[PDB]
Amino acid sequence: HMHESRLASARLYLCTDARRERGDLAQFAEAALAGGVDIIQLRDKGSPGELRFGPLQARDELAACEILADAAHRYGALFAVNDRADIARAAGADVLHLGQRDLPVNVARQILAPDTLIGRSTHDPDQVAAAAAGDADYFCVGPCWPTPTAPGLGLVRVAAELDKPWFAIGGINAQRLPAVLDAGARRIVVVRAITSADDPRAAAEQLRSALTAA
Amino acid sequence: HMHESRLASARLYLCTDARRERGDLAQFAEAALAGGVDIIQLRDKGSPGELRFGPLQARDELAACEILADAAHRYGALFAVNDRADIARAAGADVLHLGQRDLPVNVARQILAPDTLIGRSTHDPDQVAAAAAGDADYFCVGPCWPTPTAPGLGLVRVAAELDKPWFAIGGINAQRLPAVLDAGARRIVVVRAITSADDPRAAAEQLRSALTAA
Structure with missing residues (x-):
């Protein structure tokens, strides 16, 4: 109900790992949410934590979800969980990506409470089309920039010219944001831009200022 | 309904990874089930495949579940999925471990169809007690033998002297089985004993012969 409304206006999307190697998840989420993050997603896959201790077990993941879910709700933001529908339901997440x-x-x-929102990742023009017409509540478009693991801004353009909310994603930061907006994107998902900042709050405020400035 | 009955008599439990690096999952499961395996569980965590390609994604996991679920049912065996209740429901697994x-x-x-069975891993006397009295349909006891990642046979003994089915697990093979039976165990879960055998069928028949021989 209210989630669609909050999603509809969300412009700054953040994906964060559990930060098991730093132990500052709670404080980190505070800083980021106080900085303007509208939606925050727990996505530990491929994190330094996963590389050092292995994949996140359900119990620990639920613990991190409660921290993130509580902070998000205290700031009026949405909380999303990646891939696991069972974790999402156990954690009462607002979104399953x-x-x-x-x-x-x-x-x-079939598993999620009826009001939970669903997001989808898209990587080519067909998936974008399927997502825009699909059942999804929103979708992401990218990676805009290559990573050791890329559609580029051309796909962002395809999304811009077709109303479901969609986000641009993939190596986005302050310097590259102008290009993303140029390609017609109005919403973005960021990771390292805030995740590895010395001051998450400031990093987030800076990104949100440019975002709303369009 | 029928699952409890099949579980009640099961003596040889097998845990196998998706075998993504060998691509012989289907044939491997045939051999093992034709060899007497009563229950087969997909558990890819810490496998060579996970080390080379990373954790198993849901789509691939579901693909492996269908292969294993079909083979298990053709042989009158039970099919179990590890940890993910969402995968278990999507795959129609008989068991969630x-x-x-x-x-x-x-x-x-809350997620699983009402007839799905649930198993639990136990590692000390308190968990064994909690499992025997708990909601669980069955539980495992171990690891009986150390691994680079151990309760030993002492815990198997605690389980034997207390009726819920329980299995002995942890580095079990042909040579060590006599000790496991000595400690009072009547059911076992094996992995490498069959998983890395040159002839899974024979390896399995051999284990089941000693098992029923008690």
């Missing part, structure tokens, strides 16, 4: 290789949307809709 | 650090049982019982 499903990439192309994660659980099938229709399967997730 | 939950270790101590995985999803909470009560959470899983």
Whole structure:
């Protein structure tokens, strides 16, 4: 109900790992949410923590979800969980984000409370089309910039010219944001731009200032 | 309904990774099930595949579940999925196995079809007690033998002297089985004993012969 409304206006999306190697998850989320983050997603896959201790177990993941879910709600933000529909339901997440290789949307809709929102990752023009017409509540478009693991801004353009909310994602930061807005994107998902900042709050405020400034 | 009955008599339990680096999952499961395996569980965590390609994504996991679920059912065996209640429901698994650090049982019982069975891993006398008295349909006891990641046979003994089915687990093979039976165990979960055998079928038949021979 209210989630669609909050999502509809969200412009700054953040994905963060559990930060198990730093132990400052709670404080880090405070800083970032106080900085303007509208939606925050727990996505530990490929994190330094996963590299040092291995994949996140459910118990620990639930613990991190409660921290993130509580902070998000105290700031009027949305809390999203990646791939696991069982964790999402146990944690009462506002959003379940499903990439192309994660659980099938229709399967997730069977487990999740009816009001939970679903997001999808898209990487080519066909997925973008399928997402815009699909069941999804929102979708991401990218990676805009290459990573050791890339559609580029051309796909952002395809999304801009087709009303479901969609976000631009992939190596986005302050310096590259002008190009992202140029390609027609009005919402963005960021990671390292805030995740590895010396001052998450400031980093976030800076990004949100440029965002609303369009 | 029928699952409790099949579980009640099961003596040979097998845990196998998706075998992504070998691509012989289907044939491997055939051999093992034709060899007497009563229950087969997909548990990819810490596998060579996870080390080379990373954690198993949901889509791929579901693909492996369908292979294993079909083979198990063709042989009258049970098919179990580890930790993910969402994957279990999507795959129609007969069993969801939950270790101590995985999803909470009560959470899983909310997602799973009512007839799905739940198993639990136990590692000390208190967990064994909690499992024997708990909601669980069965539980495992171990690791009996150390691994680079150990309760030993002393815990198997605690389980034997208290009726819920329980399995002995942890570095079990042909040579060590006599000790396991000595400690009072009547059911076992094996991994490498069959998983890395040159002839899974024969390896399995051999283990089941000693098992029933008690």
